[PDB]
Amino acid sequence: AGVMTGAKFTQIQFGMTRQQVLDIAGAENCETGGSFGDSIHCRGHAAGDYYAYATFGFTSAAADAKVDSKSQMKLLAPSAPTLTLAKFNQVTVGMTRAQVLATVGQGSCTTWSEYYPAYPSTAGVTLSLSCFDVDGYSSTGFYRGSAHLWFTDGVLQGKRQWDLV
Amino acid sequence: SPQPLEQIKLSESQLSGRVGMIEMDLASGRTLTAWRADERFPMMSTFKVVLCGAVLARVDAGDEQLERKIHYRQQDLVDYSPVSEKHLADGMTVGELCAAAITMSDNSAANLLLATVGGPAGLTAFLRQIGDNVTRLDRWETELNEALPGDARDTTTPASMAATLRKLLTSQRLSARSQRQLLQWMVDDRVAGPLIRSVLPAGWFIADKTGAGERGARGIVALLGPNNKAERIVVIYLRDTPASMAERNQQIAGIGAALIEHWQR
Numbered sequence: 045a046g047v048m049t050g051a052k053f054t055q056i057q058f059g060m061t062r063q064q065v066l067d068i069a070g071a072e073n074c075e076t077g078g079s080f081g082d083s084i085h086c087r088g089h090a091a092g093d094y095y096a097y098a099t100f101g102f103t104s105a106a107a108d109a110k111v112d113s114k115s116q117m118k119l120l121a122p123s124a125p126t127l128t129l130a131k132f133n134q135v136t137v138g139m140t141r142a143q144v145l146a147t148v149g150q151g152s153c154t155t156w157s158e159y160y161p162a163y164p165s166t167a168g169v170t171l172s173l174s175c176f177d178v179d180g181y182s183s184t185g186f187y188r189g190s191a192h193l194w195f196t197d198g199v200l201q202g203k204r205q206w207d208l209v
Numbered sequence: 210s211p212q213p214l215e216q217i218k219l220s221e222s223q224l225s226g227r228v229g230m231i232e233m234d235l236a237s238g239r240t241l242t243a244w245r246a247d248e249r250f251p252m253m254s255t256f257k258v259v260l261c262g263a264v265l266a267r268v269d270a271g272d273e274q275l276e277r278k279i280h281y282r283q284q285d286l287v288d289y290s291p292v293s294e295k296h297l298a299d300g301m302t303v304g305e306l307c308a309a310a311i312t313m314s315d316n317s318a319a320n321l322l323l324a325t326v327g328g329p330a331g332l333t334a335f336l337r338q339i340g341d342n343v344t345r346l347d348r349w350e351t352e353l354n355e356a357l358p359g360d361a362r363d364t365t366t367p368a369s370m371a372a373t374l375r376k377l378l379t380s381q382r383l384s385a386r387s388q389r390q391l392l393q394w395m396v397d398d399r400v401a402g403p404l405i406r407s408v409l410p411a412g413w414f415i416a417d418k419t420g421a422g423e424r425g426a427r428g429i430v431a432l433l434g435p436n437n438k439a440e441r442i443v444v445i446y447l448r449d450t451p452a453s454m455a456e457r458n459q460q461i462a463g464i465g466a467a468l469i470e471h472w473q474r
Contacts, residue, residue, distance in 0.1 A: 101295070
């Protein structure tokens, strides 16, 4: 069983039902309603003043609604964080996802949130990437070199960094 | 089971850290037990009770409504924002933002609220206005958690924080409805399990707010008492220790347990 994990997050997919999500995540780790509306929010290990977590959004409140949104914090580590303030400064609004990644480093990023508001269409897809310098990521504490890069339709709309070089 | 100051000395010795603690009678404001009470400690998320105090003050004055919807953007999102990040597309009400900030230490929620009261400078001016001349907020989330050694930014003292909490929750300064609301958000705290709640006896009341920061910073502010009624304010802060989160939580819980064991001694 265990708490929410990166492995479970990856196994959960866009297009899944609420029951499918709960079955992979482990229902005892999850909640809905209250602060989270009709999304499902699942806790991982303790981190900082909260927990690593995943949040799954659905196309509607219906039992057969599908996952159209996946978000996570501290469930996944970057592959090869090579981000630097320099590379961050090379990133420009209007850039493609490919252009951005080539700039910051192909293993510098994880997916913070990804939402298909027109699911199953990709139109208007919004994506937030969490990217990290060599020692910037932490799964249990606080980042020491990270950036938020956000996109609509696969094109960069904005960027923000903390603690880079 | 050690007396509170004995337990604190054991904790500093074991952690190589500095602990700050005040135990204050809620009704009278008298200081009952104190340790490094005039030293500065990073507030971390404990500042959010003061933040929402300032928000409620505006509500009382007719300058704010808890039902007012705030819409925000990707630009506004920072780490540790589980609730505000979920509601990005829809917005959140002021009251929903305070609930997220207090009960779940939601960082972006706190930043959004901070803008409504004039930013860190504005919140600091509110503190000065209620007679707290010590506590200061200088930065936004997430930098305010950096806890660099000797840095006075975003710090309080146990003495000042205890007095300020007493002022916010029990003095003339907020309306009865606002006091009840601030207290209710603290009662509904979701992230404080490993701290005082872990050693709180059956039948006691607790309302609290926690914080965690870099360089070992950790803290809790709480109102608690027997017979399901608040009797005292307890503030415990830790700074400057390389110890694990598990060890830091256990020590704070242990200090809480000592205060409880020696409640009438």
